[PDB]
Design an enzyme around this catalytic site. Structure first.
Site, PDB file in Angstrom:
ATOM      1  N   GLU A  44       0.899  -1.235   0.101  1.00 57.09           N
ATOM      2  CA  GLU A  44      -0.020  -0.115   0.264  1.00 57.09           C
ATOM      3  C   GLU A  44       0.913   1.094  -0.018  1.00 57.09           C
ATOM      4  OE1 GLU A  44      -3.854   1.329   1.230  1.00 57.09           O
ATOM      5  OE2 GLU A  44      -2.765   2.975   0.702  1.00 57.09           O
ATOM      6  N   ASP A  98       1.389   3.987  -3.593  1.00 59.37           N
ATOM      7  CA  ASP A  98       0.980   5.474  -3.566  1.00 59.37           C
ATOM      8  C   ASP A  98       1.999   6.390  -4.132  1.00 59.37           C
ATOM      9  OD1 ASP A  98      -1.025   4.568  -1.277  1.00 59.37           O
ATOM     10  OD2 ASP A  98      -0.908   6.525  -0.642  1.00 59.37           O
ATOM     11  N   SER A 125      -7.212   2.706  -3.901  1.00 61.56           N
ATOM     12  CA  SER A 125      -5.764   3.474  -3.383  1.00 61.56           C
ATOM     13  C   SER A 125      -4.776   3.502  -4.594  1.00 61.56           C
ATOM     14  CB  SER A 125      -5.057   2.956  -2.507  1.00 61.56           C
ATOM     15  OG  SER A 125      -5.882   2.334  -1.370  1.00 61.56           O
ATOM     16  N   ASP A 152     -15.947   9.565 -19.679  1.00 55.73           N
ATOM     17  CA  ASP A 152     -17.179   9.090 -19.209  1.00 55.73           C
ATOM     18  C   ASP A 152     -17.353   7.466 -19.154  1.00 55.73           C
ATOM     19  OD1 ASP A 152     -19.790   9.232 -18.014  1.00 55.73           O
ATOM     20  OD2 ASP A 152     -20.381   9.196 -20.045  1.00 55.73           O
ATOM     21  N   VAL A 153     -17.187   7.025 -17.850  1.00 53.57           N
ATOM     22  CA  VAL A 153     -17.361   5.511 -17.921  1.00 53.57           C
ATOM     23  C   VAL A 153     -18.967   5.302 -17.799  1.00 53.57           C
ATOM     24  CG1 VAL A 153     -17.050   3.439 -16.501  1.00 53.57           C
ATOM     25  CG2 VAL A 153     -15.416   5.343 -16.553  1.00 53.57           C
ATOM     26  N   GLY A 178     -23.604   5.079 -15.683  1.00 54.62           N
ATOM     27  CA  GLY A 178     -24.380   5.368 -16.744  1.00 54.62           C
ATOM     28  C   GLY A 178     -23.813   6.560 -17.509  1.00 54.62           C
ATOM     29  N   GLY A 203     -24.222  10.248 -18.024  1.00 52.13           N
ATOM     30  CA  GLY A 203     -23.718  11.286 -17.184  1.00 52.13           C
ATOM     31  C   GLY A 203     -22.559  10.924 -16.020  1.00 52.13           C
ATOM     32  N   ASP A 250     -22.192   9.557 -12.412  1.00 50.68           N
ATOM     33  CA  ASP A 250     -22.830   8.505 -11.750  1.00 50.68           C
ATOM     34  C   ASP A 250     -21.905   8.202 -10.209  1.00 50.68           C
ATOM     35  OD1 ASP A 250     -21.361   6.511 -14.425  1.00 50.68           O
ATOM     36  OD2 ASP A 250     -20.562   6.134 -12.283  1.00 50.68           O
TER      37      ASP A 250
HETATM   38 CA   LIG Z   1     -20.853   7.746 -16.263  1.00 60.94          CA
END
Ligand SMILES: [Ca+2]
Ligand SMILES: [Ca+2]
Ligand SMILES: [Cl-]
Ligand SMILES: [Cl-]
Ligand SMILES: [Zn+2]
Ligand SMILES: [Zn+2]
Ligand SMILES: [Zn+2]
Ligand SMILES: [Zn+2]
Ligand SMILES: [Zn+2]
Ligand SMILES: [Zn+2]
Ligand SMILES: [Zn+2]
Ligand SMILES: [Zn+2]
Lengths: 529, 529
Positions: free
Chosen positions: A237, A241, A440, A482-483, A504, A506, A508
């Site tokens: 971890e 980083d 992370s 945009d995913v 979706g 826009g 989310d």
């Molecule tokens: Ca989205």
């Protein structure tokens, strides 16, 4: 008397072995969170200074400005002291904002000082850090109810925990060029903070860069380490980083915060917060890996932390937090299941970073939601106005909207943004480790890309981005990929069968506005305004 | 020196507290599984006696026949007794079949007896239950290798774990009529076995029958109770099995086995298995709720338990097991994930019962899989010929077939049948409990119905159904309602995502052949062959 945190979960987390009751004469470090003053005013200042459609945008407050604004009254400082003087509080230090005080008391002193407290002592983790905590609630005398918010060090334990992602993969995917790197002769710096009992090693970083860093200018090492102790064993971890911050924000001076206060009976996150307010000259971008279940936190703690975050934004700091690795989460109340939001992720004054995944097994053409990507709606903080548009849009248009039994639509929704959280190569203890996953991972990637954009602004005549969110939402996330596909995880049950919210078109609550297309981001965040 | 069980998981399960190292002089009860003769003969006899195309069909062995068949050689009996005598083993109990031997030994003597064994002691679960176990492996002198399968009590720990469903509802759905009940003047009996720290109380049964038994003839109490030496609190599971056995198979004399041996250093399930072979006149149908992860079990134990299950089939005992409550399960082996089968459920000589739920809130028109319904493919026992046709059909014709990586197609597939597992009403400690869910619910419901069918057979002079699967599969499961919508759970990972096998038009590894439509079932199992 008075009980300031009756709603603070006190139960022992797993991975913690209980030693017995604590030895009367045995010492302890308590940190007293002193009553601040002009909190409402600070909240106005933050918005004035971070809303770009506001003349004071970018006119950030110095640490000194913040201290003149927020510092406790003379009655507070005098009453807290003396009160602490008696009871034996020994050599203590404050901070610049003078709204914190950490002292050393024997437990029997603390136990009289904080009636109801009964300190036990514990040892936990894979590694093994010591703490002194009380599984019973505590009270302050009624006198200083209006002068102390809470006492740190009583209940909250420190944290315990497709193709392979490489720096080149990240730079390719987020359209970073070989030249899109820091021209390290300005005062632009970046930081990451992490709070486990791990060490980042200079050697592991050098090894990492030798393997992965050939095609971009990079800093040899960390400029500064805050909160180091002795000789250590590295963990994945702490390595992730730093290694990925210094890859996504390549030739940029980098500070590392290494679980401040931990080696002692202290709350690491609280100590780091305290530290922010004890040095005036700080890095502009901070990537942080830290979370608790929102519901486990006292109102006094959760509200006060939110204020510290406000103080960061006032100073033009940009704070990013991992959205979490349990999806929507899972919480069983009365006799039901709800989603379980997380905090400092749910804070309105932070940029929360979700988790992303590759769509196809063998190609890096497209990003899809990573199953684990934390997101949701706060049960404590109302929807901030800056997301009113995006959030209502989501609620009214989403086909796969979970039963409203599972969440509160009125709450601050998150995450704000996202990046790859899946399958990272890291170097730790001079060995390379294949498939490291988590938000992370995505938070430092997003962080460094931001820090890089800060360079273009400050080298130009402009102020740093600070608290990014109002601009971000205002500009309709523009710049970010945009995913659109996938949902994150939740409860293994009949209503919500392993499934939280879905991504979706826009914004989310799985991936926010999505993922950082550097060129496009640059443009939008470098527009005048 | 021989290690008979190197492949037995020795790790402490959760909900167990470790006391110290056991005191030398502290007595301890070990159960020695002695080497059997003619096991392959036993196997041939089972098929001859359980295959309806056999002219030996229904011609069951007596307990004394089984004992004559299977008993250890005189060499093993003598060699084992010399050996224990000299170890100091104090007065020992055997059983009729002479293949089990339970002795009392000092801990010190057990340690000499069995080099490597180091005994610790532990207290249990929601019930403070005492066991003495070795976290280290043990071996036997090479001399005993031919003569001892294993020693019980060394590593396996006992277990610790929409409208309501009513007897009424169950009877409606499974087309039981108010007259479809036992005319309790034959020797037909039934039984349930449970292995938790819980007691069933007669009072609760009486209360249950007063509230739900309104409109069907039923028996007042349990005819017999094996394994109880005092008072206690009623547990939900002990209540459930008995209350719903006597509703599904109503007005039929009923026996309860209550965690035999538990109050000592004994493996309750093993101890129950011994008792089977110590009484000649036993109930025909036995409903059993017990299970371990298949992979956790030694070869010697798992093969031997299967053999004891064969002994039961040979005698025309019908043994039913719950298919488990974690769907296909989840197992992180090396670096991967696979489904996780359960055993005795995976045994080819048992009838395994999965889990069903009602589709609509208010109507009983249709069954759907209950998410938690256990099922899958054995990694130990191969597909028995009696199910060759059905599994091949499922394998070849199922759409939503999980990655083949997650399971082994060539294994005994299960569950074989199913029944409601969702939302049972139970009376426990004189209080009614509303939402009892599990596959331990469905097993007694299935068993009771089966036991009623036995009555129709025995009256009218036919043999008991015994081990049912060959007939059941041969007759293409007919007379069971075929379940077709829904899948059970599995790993929360990115390749399978909370979903295991799915139900399909015929036999499937979530509900087997499905649900008991009594009239139809009656007709097929009461007719010829
Ligand atoms: Ca989205
Ligand atoms: Ca089916
Ligand atoms: Cl600007
Ligand atoms: Cl017949
Ligand atoms: Zn106490
Ligand atoms: Zn201590
Ligand atoms: Zn992946
Ligand atoms: Zn707009
Ligand atoms: Zn040892
Ligand atoms: Zn003991
Ligand atoms: Zn249900
Ligand atoms: Zn056929």
């Amino acid at each position: 008397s008075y009980s300031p945190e009756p709603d603070q979960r006190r139960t022992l987390p797993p991975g913690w072995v209980s030693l017995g009751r604590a030895d009367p004469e045995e010492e302890l470090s308590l940190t007293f969170a002193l009553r601040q003053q002009n909190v409402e005013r600070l909240s106005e200042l933050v918005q004035a200074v971070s809303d770009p459609s506001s003349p004071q945008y970018g006119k950030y407050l110095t640490l000194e400005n913040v201290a003149d604004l927020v510092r406790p009254s003379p009655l507070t400082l005098h009453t807290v002291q003396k009160w602490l003087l008696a009871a034996g509080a020994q050599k203590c230090h404050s901070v610049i904002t003078q709204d914190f005080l950490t002292c050393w008391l024997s437990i029997r002193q603390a136990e009289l000082l904080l009636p109801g407290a009964e300190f036990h002592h514990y040892v936990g983790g894979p590694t093994e850090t010591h703490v002194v905590r009380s599984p019973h609630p505590y009270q302050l005398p009624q006198a200083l109810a209006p002068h102390v918010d809470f006492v740190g060090g009583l209940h909250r334990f420190p944290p315990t925990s497709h193709l392979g992602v490489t720096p080149s993969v990240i730079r390719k995917r987020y359209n970073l060029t070989s030249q899109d790197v820091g021209s390290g002769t300005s005062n632009n710096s970046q930081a990451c903070a992490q709070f486990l009992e791990q060490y980042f090693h200079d050697s592991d970083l050098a090894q990492f860069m030798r393997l992965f860093g050939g095609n971009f200018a990079h800093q040899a090492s960390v400029a500064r380490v805050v909160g180091q102790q002795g000789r250590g064993r590295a963990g994945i971890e702490a390595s992730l980083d730093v290694q990925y911050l210094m890859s996504a924000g390549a030739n940029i001076s980098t500070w590392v915060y290494s679980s401040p206060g931990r080696h002692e009976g202290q709350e690491p996150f609280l100590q780091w917060l305290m530290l922010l307010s004890n040095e005036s000259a700080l890095p502009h971008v901070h990537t942080v890996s830290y979370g608790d279940d929102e519901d486990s936190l006292s109102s006094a703690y959760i509200q006060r932390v939110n204020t510290e975050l406000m103080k960061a934004a006032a100073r033009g700091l940009t704070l990013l937090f991992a959205s979490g690795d349990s999806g929507a989460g899972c919480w069983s109340v009365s006799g039901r299941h709800q989603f379980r939001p997380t905090f400092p992720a749910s804070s309105p004054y932070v940029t929360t970073v979700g988790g992303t995944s590759f769509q196809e097994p063998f190609l890096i053409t497209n990003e899809i939601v990573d199953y684990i990507s934390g997101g949701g709606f706060s049960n404590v903080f109302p929807r901030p106005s800056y997301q009113e548009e995006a959030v209502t849009k989501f609620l009214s248009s989403s086909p796969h909207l979970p039963p409203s039994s599972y969440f509160n639509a009125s709450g601050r929704a998150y995450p704000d943004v996202a990046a790859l959280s899946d399958g990272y190569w890291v170097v730790s203890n001079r060995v390379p480790i294949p498939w490291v996953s988590g938000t992370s991972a995505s938070t430092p990637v997003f962080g460094g890309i931001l820090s890089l954009i800060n360079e273009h602004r400050i080298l130009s005549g402009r102020p740093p981005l600070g608290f990014l969110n109002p601009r971000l939402y205002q500009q309709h996330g523009a710049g970010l990929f945009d995913v659109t596909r996938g949902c994150h995880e939740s409860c293994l049950d009949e209503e919500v069968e392993g499934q939280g919210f879905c991504s979706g078109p826009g914004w989310d609550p799985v991936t926010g506005w999505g993922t950082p297309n550097f060129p496009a981001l640059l443009k939008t965040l470098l527009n005048p305004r």
